[PDB]
C-alpha cells in the first residue's frame, strides 16, 4: 500500500493521479463565471451511483413548485421498503415521514430507502430523466431503483453521467434558474449539510470554500463526489465533479484519490 499511497500523494495533475491508482478518473473543474472547464476524461461515461440523488431531490423540488404542499406530504415507511443502507428511514418503519425530510435524508446520508420512496412520489427514474432533459442535460440518465442502479458495465449507459454533463447540470440546477430561488437554496443547503464526504473532495479543499457535495460509490470499484464550491469571500462559484473507477486499490484509497482531486483543483483555481 505504501508506494500507491505515495504515488497518489505525489500526483500534481489529474492524468498522473489516474495513473497512480491504475484507475479511470473523470474530472470537471468548472468556472461558473466564464464557463471554462479543466479536467480529465470529461465526456466519458461513469456510473452515477448515489450522485444521482442530487437530481432526484431536484425533481421533487421542481414538482413541488407546481404542487404546493407536496413537501409536507407524509409517506409511509414500510418494513418491506427497508434496505441495508437506510440510516434515517430505519427509525421510521411502521410510521411515515415528510417528503422534505426524505429529500434531506437521501442527500445528507445517502439513505437508499428514502431515495426509493421519493422515486415513488415523482414517477420513478423516467421522471428524473425527464427533469434532466427539460433542464438541458441530454447525457445523464436515471433508469433503475436502489440498489440495482449502482451496477455498471462498459457500454451500458443506464444510470450514468459524464463529469462535464453533471458539472453543467449542477450549475443550472443548484446555481441557475431551473428551480425557483427558494427551491434551489433548499437544495444547496442540503448539499452543504452533506455528512458522507469528509474524506473525499472536502478533505483536499481549503477553508476559502464553502462546499456542498454529494458522494456515491459501489462495492466493485466506483467512488464519486460532485461539489459546488462557493468562495466564502464572495465571487463566482466553481463546480467540481469527480468520478473514479479503480478496482486495484482499496475503498479507503479511493477516497484518498478524490481528496487529491480536491488538492489539485484548489491549486488550479489559484
Numbering used by the authors: 20 to 57, 59 to 238, 240 to 291
What does the literature reporting this entry say, word for word?
Of particular clinical importance is the widely disseminated class A SBLs, including the mobile, plasmid-encoded extended-spectrum CTX-M and carbapenem-hydrolyzing KPC families (both produced in opportunistic Gram-negative bacteria, such as Klebsiella pneumoniae, Pseudomonas aeruginosa, and Escherichia coli), as well as chromosomally encoded L2 from Stenotrophomonas maltophilia (a lung colonist of cystic fibrosis patients). SBLs hydrolyze antibiotics via formation of a hydrolytically labile acyl enzyme intermediate, while MBL catalysis proceeds without a covalent intermediate. The diazabicyclooctanes (DBOs), including avibactam, relebactam, and others, are a new BLI class with improved activity against a wider range of SBL targets than classic BLI scaffolds. DBOs inhibit SBLs through covalent formation of a carbamyl ester to the active-site serine concomitant with DBO ring opening.
L2 (an SBL) is one of two intrinsic β-lactamases, with L1 (an MBL), which together provide resistance to all β-lactams, making S. maltophilia one of the most extensively drug-resistant pathogens in the clinic and one of the most difficult to treat. For L2 (Kiapp, 2.7 μM), both the second-order carbamylation rate constant (4,000 ± 620 M−1 s−1) and off-rate (0.00055 ± 0.00021 s−1) are relatively high. Relebactam cocomplex structures were obtained after 16-h soaks for CTX-M-15 (1.12 Å, P212121), L2 (1.78 Å, P212121), KPC-2 (1.04 Å, P21212), KPC-3 (1.06 Å, P21212), and KPC-4 (1.04 Å, P21212). For L2, electron density consistent with a single conformation of relebactam (refined at full occupancy) was observed in one of the two molecules in the asymmetric unit (chain B). Consistent with previous observations for other potent L2 inhibitors in this crystal form, we observe a noncovalently bound molecule from the crystallization solution (d-serine) in the chain A active site. In addition, the L2 structure contains two active-site water molecules uniquely observed bridging relebactam and residues Tyr272, Arg244, Lys234, and Gly236. In L2, two conformations of His105 are observed on relebactam binding, with one configuration the same as that observed in the L2:avibactam and native structures, which each contain a single His105 conformation. As in CTX-M-15, these movements are not observed in unliganded enzyme or in the avibactam-bound L2 structure. These energetically unfavorable clashes may indicate why relebactam is 30-fold worse than avibactam at inhibiting L2. In the complex with L2, which contains intact (i.e., nondesulfated but ring-opened) relebactam in a single conformation, Lys73 and Ser130 were similarly close to one another. Despite this proximity, Ser130 is ∼3.9 Å away from the N6 nitrogen, and so relebactam appears to still not be primed for recyclization in L2.
